[PDB]
Design a protein around this nucleic acid. Structure first.
Ligand SMILES: [Zn+2]
Lengths: 40, 1362, 72, 235, 42
RNA sequence: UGUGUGUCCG
């Protein structure tokens, strides 16, 4: 029962990692938007 | 003998490029073409021998070298050509003029007698009726010109044969004009002193060809000048003269019927319009059609100016006036018109502007646009016009494309949900659509007003395919007798070698669809799908896409495209797939009128989240084809591919079109600078280009219509208004419902509705522009009551007449396969019926039809093109000359008895007849009673039965076994079958057309008629769902005589030539009619005596025929009473007693139908004097399992099983009979199809076949204005005398009779309030409940059918079940 | 001991995650705002490129000669 | 010992429940952005022509580059407004066509543009014959409207009068007797040589001029000669 | 008592965290796919 | 010698 805490903790770290990856990929997408559109 | 058959009507564009060759052979000068290659090319073998023709040299011996264009001379020829000269034709058309007038008088008398007999007639008649019509006919302006032009047409059409050596010419000298004809070429010699002059002293025709100084010395001492043209101009002039004669005659005759006010404009204003247009054309050349084209919009604006006159009603007329003024000013500045000519040239549009007529007269005048001719076309100008708008660069907004795509997906999903149960099992990560998850879980759909924050959520929805790719239920689409493009290897083989300058290396074998469908060994639907999926249309030899100029119009030139055979198959398959899958989620054709709709339903529909007002505006769908780019249409194409199981099928056009070399396949001019060196990579010039980025008219029309509907739906979502749309031809109309409170008056309601319509129009313009497609604010108009769309025009709910467009096209000569008399008469009858369907007058159309019928009969008797010159059909088929009496009697017996009659007066009441035999018998009896030949019925109706099989009986269930009532379809089908037997290596057609196909068809037909009693309609309906029906529909593809006489496969089958067989069958048919007292028997006539009933007569006639088919079994479900003979009218007065219902109604009484007139008037335009001008208030078991996306074969099998189960209900053989039929269609066995068959529980199967399965739609044959002013009660019949009465035709008969009775009297004087329709006690019977009984089984082996198409398919339950 | 480690692991980045979520929301909304002001033009080599890409994805090889309208 | 650890774990795990409400909106906006830009990349091929590439391509052989390209409203507008960098003519006309349709409202949708010559031609198209004094009346009406900027009121009133039922001559009469600018105005005076310039149809309309002419009273124009000869016209 | 409270606390934070983890994984997948599509463009 | 001068999608 106490050892079952890992099942309730292992998704959270992957959640944080995926959030970091999402932030990175969105920041990367901003670069393509800047490089493609003419803008001012 | 010959393989040529020129047509009698104009059906090709007018091009004069080749004329430049002819003038080079005779030594004249002409400049008709813009291609310098024709200036110094090599003349053909013919039209080069003209230097050795003595007649041509004699003709061109006193004329200048210079010539003039023909487009400046056509009005002059029309004005100055009457029949007074000498013509080579021996029987002149003017000789037989008295007989036509006599026949017309007789037909008018018969129609009047029939109308009086029915009970309509007319009140306050006049004696001066026949003489007025005779004077109107004989006083026509174009009476003799028409005969002269028909003689000229006969001469040129006969001369266009003789393709061999030693060709001849014909000569006509008509006072001022001289005409010479030689092999499709015509020379006109005309005086100079009758041409309009410039300010420099030269004719206006010579300005664009010669300088001012060259022409003067070129003519010098001459008084006659020569013009050269083709044989198409003569046909066009003949057609114009016929149309003008018809219009003048109809307008003059209609004045006699209603002297006070008629629905046709006049017979004097139209003549002035004709003269003004002719003068404008003679001055301005072919550029006057730019001004002639403005007739229709001006008429529309003038009609629009017949309302309450809001602020913006007059903007359309102002814009059109400005446009016509600008166009007139910018085409006349170069030309040096005199001040007098400048003043006179504006009379056309000044008369048009200053017109003052009722809206009905303007709507009728709307239909004379093509009465002046058509322009001369050039390839260069058309190509230059197409190149623009097709290679131009566009700017697009991604957000609007995103919204349109989302609306597209939402509409498809909504259509799937509305039917078919519920949602379509959305896959693909439901967490990506937050907001639609609740609706999907609850199994509901969002209403509509709230889909603005979840529109993007429709982008993420994914699903399996929703439609099937094997839904082809008609194989006739892949063989249609058309022409295609050639392979890229021999792309330049379609031009004449002499004009080209070199002999092309490669040649094509054939260029027509039927001679390529039969030699494709690996043909199949799956093969076409695999061809499309592998991008095989990108092969180097499959990229040609020729152009072809369109038919008679008034523009500078419009084109259509032609593709090679496999790409054409892909295009046809794509259109067929789209017609059954998508494009049903986007209902295009929706006709609704606010003034003719229920208030409650309109209020419910208009509610988005109280009186309702509606407005509308119309936009054009013609040029949008050229405005479509791949950047906009890519997502929709990909979604269409995904909805099926295909990959690269719906984007063939955008992939293969830009890679093609664009050119026009004109026979007499190739692309500029074309030589043998640059043949593989030809250069582009004034008539060629490479990069075509837009779409093509015709192709992919359904997808573009769906995209337009999606855009309209997006506009409706964006702005909270209720919008409805309709699309037809080249236009679309959008109506907007506004809904208003109660206490808001009725004066500002129209203004607010117009403002809402304008706002919606502005929003739609912005949305459409953001997609690369531009609207025209100057051309788009906003109205409130007037809606014109396709073939229907309404003004505030009042329908407007349009009958000239159909009535003016009547002509003695038409293309009806080898100039068949029966086809021509049938076409004339159909045109008359369609014309009388509109308007409110009767006599003008019937008089025109009667005039043209006799003329066609005589002209075919004396001048048939299928025989030699001097041949007389009416002399050597009877042995004595044909006289007036025989023809008149032979035109009165109806066609159902084999008698060349197609003008039934009963068609004036309702369109579809329940039984043609009874109606024909009644008509013949009435006609024989009118004249004193009453003792002639039995020999006329006895005749001799012919030889036929059960197939013929199945084909025409309501027909008779009379040899003279048959068409030419059987002959053509036999010819096609013979050709297929000795050809057609298609390897899949051969399996279907095996050795014993005819025997199988005969056995199936014989078994279907072996029941007791015998029913014909059921057998005919069942027969169409078998392989025999597929073979029958494949066989009948021939359309024209030229295909019959020129096809390579048909005419290479050895045997006797087709021409001799055609002549023999024509002689036999002509002998069948006009003979009489020969093909009759004395064994049936006495059995038909002392009957005195039409139903019994028809039943006996039907049973005597087909006796070799029906041995002794009864025949049911084929005879119905004639409703003219079933009811009688009383015409009661406001306060009177009906004698029928009071005097003799003591014991039981008589059932009757009551008709009464309302008083509420709603609307009226222009006044309430005429009934037709006003409208009133008043509106005119489930299967256990439902298959998902079923195939065509499965649907046909289900319907066939249901029909067989229901027809034989009292027996226990329903299991054994169905199985042999299903073994050849579907893989599933019995007791599995029966689960999907709907449970049908009805009685009197004859009633279900008459008015439930709906073989015909019945409906009416009159304008629907009067139907709103009447109330009809039928419950008074009590026990309904079930029965033989068809209620829909009862209502139609009552409404039409009331309309015809009071059509020339103002409403305030109608003295009759109500009408009683009392049924007679002789023609009404009681029909019992009967069921078919089959004692045997089909016992035929149908397991050999294991092929594709409409034949046995494997795994029919692939798409799942509900 | 182990409970303290679990608490530290589960509480160390949560504040950073909450800080990152707001920034991600803001940047996504601002990009969505940018998307509504774009203008796209049409080129003359779009259909050729699409056809070449489609042909490469099935029996992968360049389409047979001669070259298409705009090969680039 | 362990109870305190469990309590601390619960206290630390409590404040992570509330991030669901603020991550739902993140999910929504991310899904929207992905859909929009996925469709954007789908509708453009493999020749998107990056901004540097098209800027370089505009300099030499100024035709637009093959394949689509992306701009911005304000950026392309400002580029167009400066005619120094040689923006391609095709791009200019395409953007002008796209932009010209944004100035459309409920009003002025199909409203025509009426000038003096167009109105004069329209009025000529309605009158019968040629050389009548009504032509001179039309000319002076158009001239006065052009110098007074009231052409559209004149045209609207003329159209209303024509549509209600009176003849065009009566329409012109109401034009000259109802429009406020035609109140107490001296008729224009033109110079003529002799009777040759006067049309034949105008011969019956000559009248000696009285003092104080009025445009409303029926004086359309005044003809003056060199030797002090002044005449007027009456309708 | 303490063990039961711990079990209840573990059960309480089970569904919502898993749901938001799934949503984050899906968002990461679709964003990575879109960026991969844009990669073969510059 | 002029391949059927042509006559397409609904
Ligand atoms: Zn009665």
């Amino acid at each position: 029962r106490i050892t079952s805490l890992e099942n309730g903790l292992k998704p959270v770290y992957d959640m944080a990692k995926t959030i970091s990856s999402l932030n990175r990929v969105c920041a990367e997408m901003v670069a393509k938007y800047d490089l493609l559109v003419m803008t001012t | 003998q010959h393989t040529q058959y020129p047509d009698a009507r104009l059906s090709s564009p007018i091009v004069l490029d080749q004329c430049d060759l002819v003038t080079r052979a005779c030594g004249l000068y002409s400049s008709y073409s813009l291609n310098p290659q024709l200036r110094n090319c090599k003349l053909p073998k013919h039209i080069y021998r003209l230097k050795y023709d003595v007649t041509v040299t004699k003709f061109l011996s006193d004329v200048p070298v210079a010539t003039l264009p023909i487009d400046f001379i056509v009005p002059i020829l029309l004005k100055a050509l009457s029949g007074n000269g000498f013509c080579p034709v021996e029987p002149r058309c003017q000789q037989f003029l008295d007989e036509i007038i006599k026949y017309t008088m007789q037909d008018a008398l018969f129609l009047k007698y029939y109308l009086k007999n029915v009970g309509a007639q007319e009140d306050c008649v006049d004696d001066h009726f026949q003489e007025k019509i005779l004077s109107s006919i004989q006083g026509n302006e174009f009476l003799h010109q028409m005969f002269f032009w028909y003689d000229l047409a006969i001469l040129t059409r006969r001369g266009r044969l003789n393709r061999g050596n030693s060709r001849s010419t014909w000569f006509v000298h008509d006072d001022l004009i001289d005409i010479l004809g030689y092999g499709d070429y015509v020379f006109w010699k005309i005086p100079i002193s009758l041409l309009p002059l410039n300010t420099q002293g030269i004719p206006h025709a010579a300005m664009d060809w010669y300088q001012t100084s060259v022409f003067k010395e070129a003519v010098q001492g001459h008084t006659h000048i020569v013009s050269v043209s083709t044989a198409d101009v003569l046909i066009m002039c003949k057609d114009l003269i016929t149309c003008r004669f018809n219009t003048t005659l109809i307008s003059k005759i209609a004045e006699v019927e209603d002297p006070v006010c008629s629905d046709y404009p006049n017979f004097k204003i139209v003549s002035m319009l004709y003269q003004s247009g002719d003068y404008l054309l003679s001055i301005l050349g072919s550029d006057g059609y730019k001004i002639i084209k403005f007739l229709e919009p001006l008429c529309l604006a003038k009609i629009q100016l017949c309302s309450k006159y809001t602020e913006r009603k007059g903007r359309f007329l102002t814009q059109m006036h400005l446009a016509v003024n600008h166009t007139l000013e910018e085409i006349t500045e170069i030309r040096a018109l005199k001040p007098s000519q400048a003043h006179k040239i504006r009379e056309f549009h000044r008369t048009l502007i200053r017109l003052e007529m009722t809206p009905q007269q303007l709507c009728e005048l709307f239909s004379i646009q093509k009465h002046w001719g058509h322009p001369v076309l050039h390839s260069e100008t058309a190509i230059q016009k197409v190149k623009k708008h097709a290679t131009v660069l566009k700017a697009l907004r991604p957000i609007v494309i995103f919204e349109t795509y989302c609306v597209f997906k939402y509409s498809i999903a909504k259509h799937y949900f509305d039917s078919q149960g519920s949602w379509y099992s959305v896959t693909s990560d439901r967490n990506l659509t937050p907001g639609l998850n609740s609706y999907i879980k609850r199994n509901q759909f969002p209403p509509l007003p709230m889909i603005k924050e979840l529109l993007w959520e429709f982008y993420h929805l994914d699903h399996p395919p929703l439609f099937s790719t094997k839904i082809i239920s008609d194989l006739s689409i892949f063989i249609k007798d058309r022409a295609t493009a050639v392979e890229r290897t021999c792309w330049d083989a379609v031009f004449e070698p002499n004009v080209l300058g070199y002999n092309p290396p490669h040649k094509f074998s054939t260029k027509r669809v039927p001679e390529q469908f039969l030699e494709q060994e690996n043909f199949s639907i799956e093969n076409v799908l695999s061809y499309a999926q592998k991008l095989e249309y990108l092969l180097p030899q499959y990229r040609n896409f020729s152009f072809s100029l369109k038919e008679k119009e008034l523009n500078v030139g419009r084109t259509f495209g032609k593709l090679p055979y496999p790409t054409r198959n892909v295009q046809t398959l794509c259109e067929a797939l789209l017609a059954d899958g998508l494009a049903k989620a986007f209902p295009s054709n929706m006709m609704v009128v606010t003034e003719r709709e229920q208030k409650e339903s309109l209020l419910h529909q208009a509610s988005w989240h109280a009186t309702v007002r509606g407005s509308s505006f119309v936009t054009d769908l013609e040029k949008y084809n050229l405005a479509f780019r791949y950047e906009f249409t890519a997502p929709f194409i990909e979604y269409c591919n995904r909805c099926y199981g295909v990959k690269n099928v719906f984007n063939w056009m955008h992939y293969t079109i830009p890679q093609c070399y664009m050119h026009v396949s004109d026979y007499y001019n190739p692309p500029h600078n074309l030589t043998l060196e640059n043949r593989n990579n030809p250069p582009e010039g004034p008539s060629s280009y490479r990069g075509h980025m837009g779409g093509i008219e015709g192709l992919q029309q359904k997808l573009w219509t769906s995209i337009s509907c999606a855009q309209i739906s997006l506009v409706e979502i964006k702005t909270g208004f209720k919008l409805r749309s309709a699309v037809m031809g080249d236009n679309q109309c959008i109506t907007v419902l506004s809904v208003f409170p109660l206490e808001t008056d009725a004066d500002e309601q129209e203004q607010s509705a117009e403002d809402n319509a304008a706002r919606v129009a502005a929003s739609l313009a912005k949305v459409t522009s953001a997609c690369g497609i531009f609207l025209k604010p100057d051309e788009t108009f906003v109205h409130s009551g007037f809606i014109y769309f396709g073939k229907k025009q309404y003004l505030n709910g009042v329908q407007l007449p349009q009958s000239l467009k159909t009535a003016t096209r009547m002509a003695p000569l038409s293309d009806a396969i080898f100039d068949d008399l029966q086809g021509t008469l049938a076409s004339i009858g159909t045109a008359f019926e369609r014309s009388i369907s509109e308007t409110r007058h009767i006599f003008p159309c019937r008089i025109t039809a009667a005039f043209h019928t006799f003329f066609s009969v005589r002209i075919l008797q004396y001048h048939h093109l299928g025989f030699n010159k001097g041949f007389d059909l009416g002399q050597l088929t009877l042995g004595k000359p044909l006289d007036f009496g025989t023809i008149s009697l032979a035109l009165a017996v109806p066609q159902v008895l084999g008698g060349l009659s197609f003008l039934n007066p009963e068609k004036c009441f309702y369109r579809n007849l329940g039984d043609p035999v009874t109606s024909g018998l009644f008509q013949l009896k009435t006609y024989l009673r009118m004249i004193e030949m009453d003792d002639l019925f039995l020999p006329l109706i006895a005749k001799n039965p012919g030889n036929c099989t059960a197939i013929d009986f199945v084909l025409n269930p309501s027909g008779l076994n009379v040899p003279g009532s048959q068409d030419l379809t059987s002959f053509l089908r036999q010819i096609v079958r013979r050709t297929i037997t000795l050809s057609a290596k298609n390897k899949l057609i051969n399996t279907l057309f095996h050795a014993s196909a005819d025997f199988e068809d005969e056995m199936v037909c014989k078994w279907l008629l072996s029941s007791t009693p015998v029913m014909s309609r059921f057998a005919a309906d069942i027969f169409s769902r078998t392989p025999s029906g597929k073979r029958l529909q494949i066989l009948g593809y021939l359309e024209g005589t030229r295909t019959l006489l020129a096809s390579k496969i048909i005419n290479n089958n050895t045997e006797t030539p087709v021409l001799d067989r055609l002549r023999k069958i024509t002689l036999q048919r002509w002998s069948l009619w006009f003979s009489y007292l020969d093909h009759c028997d004395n064994i049936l006539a006495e059995a038909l005596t002392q009957i005195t009933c039409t139903v019994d007569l028809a039943q006996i006639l039907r049973e005597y025929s087909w006796a070799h088919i029906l041995e002794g079994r009864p025949l049911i479900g084929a005879t119905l009473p004639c409703m003219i003979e079933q009811f009688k009218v009383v015409w009661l007065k406001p306060y009177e007693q009906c004698p029928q219902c009071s005097n003799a109604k003591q014991p039981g009484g008589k059932p009757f139908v009551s008709v009464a007139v309302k008083k509420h008037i709603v609307s009226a335009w222009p006044n309430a004097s005429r009934i037709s001008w006003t409208i009133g208030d008043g509106i005119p078991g489930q299967p256990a399992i439902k298959p998902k996306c079923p195939s065509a074969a499965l649907r046909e099998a289900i319907e066939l099983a249901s029909r067989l189960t229901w027809v034989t209900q009292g027996s226990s053989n329903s299991d054994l009979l169905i199985k042999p039929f299903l073994e050849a269609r579907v893989n599933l066995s019995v007791q599995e199809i029966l689960q999907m068959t709907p449970s049908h529980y009805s009685g009197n199967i004859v009633h279900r076949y008459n008015d439930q399965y709906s073989p015909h739609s019945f409906m009416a044959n009159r304008m629907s204005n009067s139907a709103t002013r009447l109330i009809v009660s039928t419950n008074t019949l009590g026990e309904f005398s079930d029965s033989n009465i068809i209620f829909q035709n009862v209502i139609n008969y009552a409404v039409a009779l009331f309309d015809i009775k009071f059509r020339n009297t103002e409403a305030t004087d109608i003295q009759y309030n109500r009408a009683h329709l009392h049924l007679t006690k002789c023609c009404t019977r009681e029909v019992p409940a009967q069921y078919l009984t089959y004692t045997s089984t089909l016992d035929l082996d149908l397991t050999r059918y294991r092929e594709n198409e409409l034949i046995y398919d494997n795994n029919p339950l692939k798409g799942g079940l509900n | 001991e182990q409970r303290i480690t679990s608490l530290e692991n589960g509480l160390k980045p949560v504040y950073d995650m909450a800080k990152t979520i707001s920034s991600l929301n803001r940047v996504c909304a601002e990009m969505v705002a940018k998307y509504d002001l774009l203008v796209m033009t049409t080129g003359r080599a779009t259909a050729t490129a699409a056809a070449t890409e489609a042909y490469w994805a099935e029996h992968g090889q360049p389409p047979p000669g001669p070259s298409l309208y705009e090969e680039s | 010992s362990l109870e305190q650890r469990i309590t601390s774990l619960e206290n630390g795990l409590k404040p992570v429940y509330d991030m669901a409400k603020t991550i739902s909106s993140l999910n929504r906006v991310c899904a929207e952005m992905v859909a929009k830009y996925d469709l954007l990349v789908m509708t453009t091929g493999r020749a998107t022509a990056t901004a540097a590439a098209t800027e370089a391509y505009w300099a030499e052989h100024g035709q637009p580059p093959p394949g689509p390209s992306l701009y911005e409203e304000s950026a392309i507008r400002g580029k167009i407004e400066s005619r120094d960098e040689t923006v391609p003519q095709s791009v200019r006309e395409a953007f002008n066509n796209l932009d010209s349709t944004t100035s459309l409202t409920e009003e002025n949708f199909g409203k025509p543009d009426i000038s003096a010559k167009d109105l004069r031609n329209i009025m000529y198209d309605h009158l019968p014959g040629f050389g009548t004094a009504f032509h001179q009346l039309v000319q002076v009406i158009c001239k006065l409207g052009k110098d007074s900027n009231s052409l559209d009121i004149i045209h609207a009133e003329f159209q209303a009068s024509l549509a209600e039922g009176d003849s065009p001559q009566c329409a012109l009469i109401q034009i000259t007797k109802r429009v406020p600018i035609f109140q107490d105005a001296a008729p224009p005076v033109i110079h003529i040589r002799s009777r040759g310039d006067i049309p034949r149809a105008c011969q019956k309309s000559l009248r000696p001029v009285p003092p104080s002419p009025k445009i409303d009273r029926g004086w359309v124009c005044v003809f003056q000669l060199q030797d002090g000869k002044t005449l007027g016209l009456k309708i």
